[PDB]
Amino acid sequence: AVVASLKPVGFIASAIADGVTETEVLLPDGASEHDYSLRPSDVKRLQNADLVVWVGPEMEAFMQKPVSKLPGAKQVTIAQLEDVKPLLMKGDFNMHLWLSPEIARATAVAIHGKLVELMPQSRAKLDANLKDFEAQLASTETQVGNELAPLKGKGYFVFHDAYGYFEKQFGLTPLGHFTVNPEIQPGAQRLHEIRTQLVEQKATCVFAEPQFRPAVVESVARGTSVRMGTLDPLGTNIKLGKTSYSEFLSQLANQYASCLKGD
Protein backbone atom coordinates (compact mmCIF):
# COMPACT_ATOMS: atom_id res chain seq x y z
CA ALA A 1 0.00 0.00 0.00
CA VAL A 2 0.85 3.66 -0.41
CA VAL A 3 0.75 5.30 3.03
CA ALA A 4 -0.11 9.00 3.10
CA SER A 5 0.37 11.28 6.12
CA LEU A 6 -2.85 13.33 5.72
CA LYS A 7 -6.19 12.51 4.12
CA PRO A 8 -5.92 14.97 1.18
CA VAL A 9 -2.42 13.65 0.35
CA GLY A 10 -4.14 10.26 0.38
CA PHE A 11 -6.76 11.53 -2.08
CA ILE A 12 -3.99 12.38 -4.58
CA ALA A 13 -2.22 9.05 -3.94
CA SER A 14 -5.49 7.10 -4.40
CA ALA A 15 -6.03 8.69 -7.83
CA ILE A 16 -2.63 7.37 -9.01
CA ALA A 17 -2.53 4.04 -7.17
CA ASP A 18 -6.12 3.08 -8.07
CA GLY A 19 -6.29 -0.54 -9.22
CA VAL A 20 -2.54 -0.87 -8.56
CA THR A 21 -2.32 -0.92 -4.75
CA GLU A 22 -4.30 0.26 -1.71
CA THR A 23 -3.92 3.69 -0.09
CA GLU A 24 -3.86 4.20 3.69
CA VAL A 25 -3.97 7.46 5.62
CA LEU A 26 -2.17 7.98 8.93
CA LEU A 27 -3.83 11.07 10.45
CA PRO A 28 -7.36 10.15 11.58
CA ASP A 29 -10.41 12.20 10.73
CA GLY A 30 -10.91 14.84 13.44
CA ALA A 31 -7.22 15.10 14.31
CA SER A 32 -5.00 18.06 13.37
CA GLU A 33 -1.89 18.04 11.24
CA HIS A 34 -0.30 20.35 13.82
CA ASP A 35 -0.79 18.25 16.97
CA TYR A 36 -0.46 14.53 16.48
CA SER A 37 1.55 11.47 17.47
CA LEU A 38 1.70 8.29 15.42
CA ARG A 39 0.11 5.18 16.89
CA PRO A 40 2.54 2.52 18.11
CA SER A 41 1.32 0.24 15.25
CA ASP A 42 2.23 2.90 12.64
CA VAL A 43 5.96 2.04 12.77
CA LYS A 44 5.32 -1.33 11.08
CA ARG A 45 2.79 0.26 8.66
CA LEU A 46 5.45 2.69 7.43
CA GLN A 47 8.09 -0.08 7.24
CA ASN A 48 5.85 -2.29 5.13
CA ALA A 49 4.56 0.51 2.86
CA ASP A 50 5.27 0.34 -0.89
CA LEU A 51 5.55 4.12 -0.83
CA VAL A 52 5.18 6.86 1.84
CA VAL A 53 3.85 10.29 0.84
CA TRP A 54 3.98 13.38 3.06
CA VAL A 55 4.43 17.16 2.83
CA GLY A 56 7.62 17.49 4.87
CA PRO A 57 9.33 18.35 8.17
CA GLU A 58 7.84 21.86 8.46
CA MET A 59 4.36 20.33 8.28
CA GLU A 60 3.99 16.81 9.79
CA ALA A 61 6.48 16.77 12.70
CA PHE A 62 5.26 13.25 13.51
CA MET A 63 6.50 11.87 10.18
CA GLN A 64 10.14 12.95 10.07
CA LYS A 65 11.82 10.28 12.21
CA PRO A 66 10.09 7.15 10.79
CA VAL A 67 10.43 8.55 7.22
CA SER A 68 14.19 9.02 7.64
CA LYS A 69 14.57 5.24 8.09
CA LEU A 70 13.02 4.44 4.72
CA PRO A 71 14.75 4.23 1.31
CA GLY A 72 14.62 7.42 -0.77
CA ALA A 73 13.03 5.22 -3.43
CA LYS A 74 10.08 4.53 -1.12
CA GLN A 75 9.12 8.09 -0.21
CA VAL A 76 7.78 11.33 -1.70
CA THR A 77 8.44 14.49 0.34
CA ILE A 78 6.20 17.00 -1.43
CA ALA A 79 7.72 20.26 -0.09
CA GLN A 80 11.19 19.18 -1.26
CA LEU A 81 10.19 18.36 -4.86
CA GLU A 82 12.20 20.40 -7.34
CA ASP A 83 9.05 21.44 -9.21
CA VAL A 84 7.37 22.40 -5.90
CA LYS A 85 10.03 24.66 -4.43
CA PRO A 86 9.33 27.52 -6.93
CA LEU A 87 5.59 27.25 -6.15
CA LEU A 88 5.99 27.76 -2.35
CA MET A 89 4.27 30.92 -1.06
CA LYS A 90 5.27 32.86 2.07
CA GLY A 91 12.35 32.60 5.50
CA ASP A 92 9.05 30.74 6.05
CA PHE A 93 6.64 29.24 3.53
CA ASN A 94 3.11 28.00 4.00
CA MET A 95 3.10 24.20 3.99
CA HIS A 96 -0.62 23.44 3.33
CA LEU A 97 0.45 22.22 -0.06
CA TRP A 98 -2.43 19.81 -0.68
CA LEU A 99 -4.78 22.71 -1.40
CA SER A 100 -2.66 23.75 -4.41
CA PRO A 101 -3.90 22.03 -7.58
CA GLU A 102 -0.50 22.68 -9.26
CA ILE A 103 1.41 21.17 -6.32
CA ALA A 104 -1.12 18.31 -6.36
CA ARG A 105 -0.09 17.75 -9.99
CA ALA A 106 3.62 17.74 -9.08
CA THR A 107 2.82 15.27 -6.28
CA ALA A 108 0.86 13.03 -8.64
CA VAL A 109 3.78 13.03 -11.11
CA ALA A 110 6.20 12.21 -8.27
CA ILE A 111 3.97 9.35 -7.05
CA HIS A 112 3.54 8.09 -10.61
CA GLY A 113 7.34 8.06 -11.10
CA LYS A 114 8.15 6.24 -7.85
CA LEU A 115 5.40 3.65 -8.47
CA VAL A 116 6.42 2.98 -12.07
CA GLU A 117 9.97 2.27 -10.77
CA LEU A 118 8.73 0.03 -7.94
CA MET A 119 6.13 -1.68 -10.13
CA PRO A 120 7.06 -1.56 -13.86
CA GLN A 121 4.39 -4.23 -14.43
CA SER A 122 1.75 -1.60 -13.64
CA ARG A 123 3.07 1.14 -15.99
CA ALA A 124 0.04 1.17 -18.32
CA LYS A 125 -2.48 1.49 -15.47
CA LEU A 126 -0.36 4.13 -13.66
CA ASP A 127 -0.05 6.08 -16.92
CA ALA A 128 -3.84 6.02 -17.44
CA ASN A 129 -4.45 6.99 -13.81
CA LEU A 130 -2.18 10.02 -14.17
CA LYS A 131 -4.03 11.08 -17.33
CA ASP A 132 -7.44 10.57 -15.64
CA PHE A 133 -6.32 12.50 -12.53
CA GLU A 134 -5.33 15.43 -14.78
CA ALA A 135 -8.69 15.28 -16.63
CA GLN A 136 -10.67 15.20 -13.37
CA LEU A 137 -8.64 17.99 -11.81
CA ALA A 138 -8.92 20.25 -14.87
CA SER A 139 -12.73 19.84 -14.86
CA THR A 140 -12.86 20.57 -11.12
CA GLU A 141 -10.69 23.67 -11.54
CA THR A 142 -13.14 24.99 -14.16
CA GLN A 143 -16.22 24.23 -12.02
CA VAL A 144 -14.68 25.57 -8.78
CA GLY A 145 -13.44 28.62 -10.69
CA ASN A 146 -16.98 29.42 -11.88
CA GLU A 147 -18.53 28.77 -8.46
CA LEU A 148 -16.07 31.06 -6.67
CA ALA A 149 -15.81 33.93 -9.21
CA PRO A 150 -18.98 35.75 -8.00
CA LEU A 151 -17.58 35.68 -4.43
CA LYS A 152 -14.61 37.92 -5.23
CA GLY A 153 -14.79 41.00 -3.04
CA LYS A 154 -16.65 39.34 -0.18
CA GLY A 155 -14.45 39.55 2.92
CA TYR A 156 -14.03 36.82 5.55
CA PHE A 157 -11.83 35.34 8.27
CA VAL A 158 -10.76 31.69 8.52
CA PHE A 159 -9.78 29.93 11.75
CA HIS A 160 -6.23 28.90 10.80
CA ASP A 161 -3.91 29.84 7.94
CA ALA A 162 -4.41 26.79 5.74
CA TYR A 163 -6.16 27.99 2.59
CA GLY A 164 -3.73 30.40 0.89
CA TYR A 165 -2.86 28.25 -2.14
CA PHE A 166 -6.53 27.57 -2.88
CA GLU A 167 -7.64 31.17 -2.29
CA LYS A 168 -4.89 32.53 -4.52
CA GLN A 169 -5.82 30.21 -7.39
CA PHE A 170 -9.54 30.88 -7.21
CA GLY A 171 -9.46 34.62 -6.54
CA LEU A 172 -11.06 34.72 -3.10
CA THR A 173 -10.29 37.66 -0.87
CA PRO A 174 -9.79 36.64 2.78
CA LEU A 175 -9.35 39.41 5.33
CA GLY A 176 -7.18 37.12 7.48
CA HIS A 177 -7.03 34.29 10.00
CA PHE A 178 -7.66 33.83 13.73
CA THR A 179 -4.44 31.84 14.23
CA VAL A 180 -1.47 30.37 12.37
CA ASN A 181 -1.24 27.52 14.89
CA PRO A 182 -4.82 26.37 15.67
CA GLU A 183 -3.81 24.77 19.00
CA ILE A 184 -2.61 28.12 20.36
CA GLN A 185 -5.63 30.26 21.29
CA PRO A 186 -6.00 33.83 19.94
CA GLY A 187 -5.34 36.69 22.39
CA ALA A 188 -8.12 38.99 23.61
CA GLN A 189 -6.53 41.78 21.53
CA ARG A 190 -6.32 39.71 18.33
CA LEU A 191 -9.96 38.73 18.83
CA HIS A 192 -10.82 42.42 19.19
CA GLU A 193 -8.75 43.28 16.08
CA ILE A 194 -10.75 40.69 14.13
CA ARG A 195 -14.05 41.90 15.64
CA THR A 196 -13.15 45.50 14.72
CA GLN A 197 -11.90 44.53 11.23
CA LEU A 198 -15.06 42.45 10.85
CA VAL A 199 -17.37 45.43 11.44
CA GLU A 200 -15.26 48.08 9.64
CA GLN A 201 -14.35 46.03 6.55
CA LYS A 202 -17.99 44.83 6.39
CA ALA A 203 -17.08 41.12 6.32
CA THR A 204 -19.59 38.55 5.06
CA CYS A 205 -18.39 35.41 6.92
CA VAL A 206 -16.19 33.90 9.62
CA PHE A 207 -15.19 30.25 9.23
CA ALA A 208 -14.75 27.58 11.88
CA GLU A 209 -13.12 24.18 11.19
CA PRO A 210 -14.36 20.69 12.24
CA GLN A 211 -11.07 19.92 14.03
CA PHE A 212 -11.61 22.64 16.66
CA ARG A 213 -14.60 23.72 18.76
CA PRO A 214 -16.07 26.88 17.20
CA ALA A 215 -16.74 28.77 20.48
CA VAL A 216 -13.98 31.36 20.00
CA VAL A 217 -15.08 32.05 16.39
CA GLU A 218 -18.69 32.45 17.59
CA SER A 219 -17.55 34.98 20.22
CA VAL A 220 -15.84 37.34 17.76
CA ALA A 221 -19.13 37.40 15.85
CA ARG A 222 -21.46 37.97 18.85
CA GLY A 223 -23.81 40.90 18.12
CA THR A 224 -22.52 41.41 14.56
CA SER A 225 -24.36 40.59 11.30
CA VAL A 226 -21.44 38.44 10.06
CA ARG A 227 -22.46 34.91 9.01
CA MET A 228 -20.83 31.73 10.31
CA GLY A 229 -19.59 28.88 8.13
CA THR A 230 -17.17 25.98 8.36
CA LEU A 231 -14.23 24.98 6.18
CA ASP A 232 -12.56 21.56 6.35
CA PRO A 233 -8.95 21.59 5.10
CA LEU A 234 -8.59 17.83 5.71
CA GLY A 235 -11.61 16.40 3.84
CA THR A 236 -13.05 14.37 6.72
CA ASN A 237 -16.31 13.69 4.85
CA ILE A 238 -14.72 12.54 1.58
CA LYS A 239 -13.76 8.86 1.24
CA LEU A 240 -10.50 7.75 -0.46
CA GLY A 241 -10.75 6.81 -4.11
CA LYS A 242 -10.12 7.62 -7.73
CA THR A 243 -12.22 10.83 -7.71
CA SER A 244 -11.58 11.83 -4.08
CA TYR A 245 -9.25 14.79 -4.71
CA SER A 246 -11.74 16.34 -7.15
CA GLU A 247 -14.56 15.71 -4.66
CA PHE A 248 -12.46 17.36 -1.93
CA LEU A 249 -11.77 20.59 -3.82
CA SER A 250 -15.45 20.74 -4.91
CA GLN A 251 -16.62 20.32 -1.32
CA LEU A 252 -14.25 23.01 -0.06
CA ALA A 253 -15.54 25.41 -2.72
CA ASN A 254 -19.09 24.44 -1.64
CA GLN A 255 -18.22 25.33 1.97
CA TYR A 256 -16.99 28.80 0.96
CA ALA A 257 -20.01 29.35 -1.30
CA SER A 258 -22.57 28.15 1.26
CA CYS A 259 -21.61 31.03 3.56
CA LEU A 260 -20.39 33.66 1.08
CA LYS A 261 -23.18 33.55 -1.55
CA GLY A 262 -25.42 36.61 -1.05
CA ASP A 263 -26.84 38.69 0.34
* Closer residue to Zn ion (CB): 30 or 262: 30
What is the helix, strand, coil percentage profile of the chain, to 5?
A: 50, 10, 40
What is the dihedral angle through the alpha carbons of 241, 242, 248, 254, rounded to the nearest 10 degrees?
-120
Query: Per CB under 5 A, which region of 83-91, 99-107, 159-167, 243-251 contacts Zn ion?
Result: 159-167
The annotation status of 34 as a binding-site residue, yes or no, is: yes
- Rounded CA separation 78/234 (Å): 16
Give phi and psi for 26, each to the nearest 5: -75, -55
Query: Per CB under 5 A, which region of 2-10, 118-126, 158-166, 219-227 contacts Zn ion?
Result: 158-166
* Closer residue to Zn ion (CB): 163 or 245: 163
> Judged by CB under 5 A, does residue 52 bind Zn ion?
no
CB 229 within 8 A of CB 255: yes
Q: How many residues at the interface with Zn ion, by CB under 5 A?
A: 1
Query: Per CB under 5 A, which region of 66-74, 156-164, 204-212, 219-227 contacts Zn ion?
Result: 156-164
The annotation status of 160 as a binding-site residue, yes or no, is: yes
The DSSP letter of residue 244 is H
* Closer residue to Zn ion (CB): 133 or 207: 207
Q: Is 210 helix (H, G, I), strand (E, B) or coil?
A: coil
Q: Give one word for 76, left, alpha or beta, with left for phi > 0 and alpha for psi -120 to 50.
A: beta
| Biggest distance spanned by C-alpha atoms of the chain | 62
Read off the amino acid at residue 216: V
Query: Per CB under 5 A, which region of 63-71, 123-131, 155-163, 249-257 contacts Zn ion?
Result: 155-163
Minimal distance in Å, beta carbon 32 to Zn ion?
A: 7
Query: Per CB under 5 A, which region of 4-12, 69-77, 157-165, 185-193 contacts Zn ion?
Result: 157-165
Other beta carbons less than 10 A from residue 201's beta carbon: 13
Minimal distance in Å, beta carbon 74 to Zn ion?
A: 26
> Judged by CB under 5 A, does residue 162 bind Zn ion?
yes
Minimal distance in Å, beta carbon 101 to Zn ion?
A: 18
DSSP string, 25-84: ESSPTT--TTS----TTHHHHHHH-SEEEE--TTT-GGGHHHHHTS-GGGEEEGGG-TTT
Minimal distance in Å, beta carbon 162 to Zn ion?
A: 4
* Omega of the bond leading into 263 within 30 degrees of 0 (cis): yes
Minimal distance in Å, beta carbon 214 to Zn ion?
A: 16
The annotation status of 192 as a binding-site residue, yes or no, is: no
Residue span 180-219 as binding mask against Zn ion, x where in contact by CB under 5 A, dash where not: ----------------------------------------
Minimal distance in Å, beta carbon 5 to Zn ion?
A: 12
Binding residues, by number, are 33-34, 96, 160
Binding-site members for Zn(2+) are 33-34, 96, 160
List interacting residues with Zn ion (CB under 5 A).
162
